[PDB]
Amino acid sequence: KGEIRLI
Amino acid sequence: KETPESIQEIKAPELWSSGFKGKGITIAVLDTGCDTEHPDLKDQIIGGKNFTDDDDGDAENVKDYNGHGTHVAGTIAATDQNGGILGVAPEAKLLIVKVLGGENGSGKYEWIIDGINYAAEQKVDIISMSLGGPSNEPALQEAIQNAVKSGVLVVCAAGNEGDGDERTEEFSYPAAYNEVIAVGSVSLARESSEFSNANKEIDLVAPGEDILSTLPNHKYGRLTGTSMAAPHVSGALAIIKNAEEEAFQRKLTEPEIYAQLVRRTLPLKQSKALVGNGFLYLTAPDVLLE
Amino acid sequence: KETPESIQEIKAPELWSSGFKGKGITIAVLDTGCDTEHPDLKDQIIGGKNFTDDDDGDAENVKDYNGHGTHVAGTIAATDQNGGILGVAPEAKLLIVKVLGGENGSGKYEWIIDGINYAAEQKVDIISMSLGGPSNEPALQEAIQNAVKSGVLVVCAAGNEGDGDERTEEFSYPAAYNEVIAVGSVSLARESSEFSNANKEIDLVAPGEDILSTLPNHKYGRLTGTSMAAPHVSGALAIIKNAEEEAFQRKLTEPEIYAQLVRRTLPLKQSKALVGNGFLYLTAPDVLLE
Amino acid sequence: KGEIRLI
Ligand SMILES: [Ca+2]
Ligand SMILES: [Ca+2]
Ligand SMILES: [Ca+2]
Ligand SMILES: [Ca+2]
Structure with a gap:
């Protein structure tokens, strides 16, 4: 439902 | 095979001299993983x-x-x-x-x-x-x-x-x-990166433009992002911890090390919303002694 | 007015210049009490x-x-x-x-x-x-x-x-x-005062010898001891809390303000056991702009 | 009993 990616 | 200009810019060698190279510090690396057989890393993991x-x-x-x-x-x-x-x-x-x-x-x-x-x-x-x-x-x-x-x-x-x-x-x-110790990115002329998030929760900034480090399969390469700034601070914390546990002759708590971290920072003139306390510079207190 | 020797020495006026004089900071003085009608203090309580x-x-x-x-x-x-x-x-x-x-x-x-x-x-x-x-x-x-x-x-x-x-x-x-932010005592010339306790929990030091400030019944006088050094720090965080909160444009937390205490510190050539991080010196990161 | 003096 909630996502992160590198940056 | 030396020291990425980035890592000399944050003044880590001048702390290796005094024998502060990270020994005794474990750092969990929450990322896409890591090729654990890379020579430059195998015995670090x-x-x-x-x-x-x-x-x-x-x-x-x-x-x-x-x-x-x-x-x-x-x-x-x-x-x-x-x-x-x-x-x-x-x-x-x-x-x-x-x-x-x-x-x-x-x-x-x-x-x-x-x-x-x-x-x-x-x-x-x-x-x-x-x-x-x-x-x-x-x-x-x-x-x-x-x-x-x-x-x-x-x-x-x-x-x-x-x-x-x-x-x-x-x-x-x-x-x-x-x-969080939120780390923004700068030019290697230390200007705020154009992609560096601004808000009121930036703590400090590190080099994040075109950074040389290891790539899987015994290879290397450059990259870009605040994803490159953060590891400069992460690593630097470990040698700050080394320098300060020696000077204070005890283990240092989380907030203390944070104080010590922003004590090793020179300020910039840009806004605190972009650069936080300033540029990660590990010889800043000496600079104060002159 | 002829502000005390020690207060100039900690660089407070150079922050009065910027408007940081304590507005909105409230400090609880646990002590022997106070003559609440001393001209220099009746308003301030x-x-x-x-x-x-x-x-x-x-x-x-x-x-x-x-x-x-x-x-x-x-x-x-x-x-x-x-x-x-x-x-x-x-x-x-x-x-x-x-x-x-x-x-x-x-x-x-x-x-x-x-x-x-x-x-x-x-x-x-x-x-x-x-x-x-x-x-x-x-x-x-x-x-x-x-x-x-x-x-x-x-x-x-x-x-x-x-x-x-x-x-x-x-x-x-x-x-x-x-x-506890422990405050030890130095002299005019920033030398560790012999009576200042030595341990691994000193954070910094401030002037603690021959400090002239208000005595009961419209009187003044000089006193000596770490008790004279801590109030230099207490009043300093007021100034500091006002300075950094402008720069960041928000309210700081207790670990952030502490970090900003240690940043305005000056490295001393004496053991951390006696002086901690060094001398309360409020322009110290301006000395870094050079 | 603790007790503590000005210092
Ligand atoms: Ca933060
Ligand atoms: Ca922006
Ligand atoms: Ca403390
Ligand atoms: Ca002693």
């Missing part, structure tokens, strides 16, 4: 744990399909003892936490939360994260909170979603949480 | 509670039968007009908590804890203590821990049992608790 989907959720498989995770690793603590490259804390130890699966390099919050909770139960000194997420989820905040009250220094890239205007803000999580 | 036995527990009577509380309260925030002297933070407000009775300036850990919690209850920004006792009573660490939990800055003089010798530790509480 102490453990590896998968929380993403890749490899049928084989938890011991941490293979880095993206590159960034090994790249982050090398910047923190790559050793030259195999004729390779150096990190900011080359006598410190990495724990590899794979919370981003697939090659485009993206993981689910519960995986990030899994690795944060893990990292603390393993009692690392430093959690290093180079990820961002656009939403503030309360389970995330609490995990961040729990780790910090546990004594862990929680470092995160601040967010790439920035535009250049210090009047307009962008919020990346977990960086945006007050507890 | 917002209330007073006494937990001693003097006046028979008449809690509204905080009058100073020793002279130190008034001297301390004067060093934090005495006012320029009505003649007289300038505190470190003349635009801030003081709360007179009287936990030390009689002329010998003694009180029980009951009355100290009471007042600490009373200042916490009243939601003040800083607790300045210049007391000290050899027993380590968990309930006292309790009170301070709860107060820092809520986000108070807890300042305390380091103790007057030093013997010049950094290889020998002397412990005074509450200074000795890690959570």
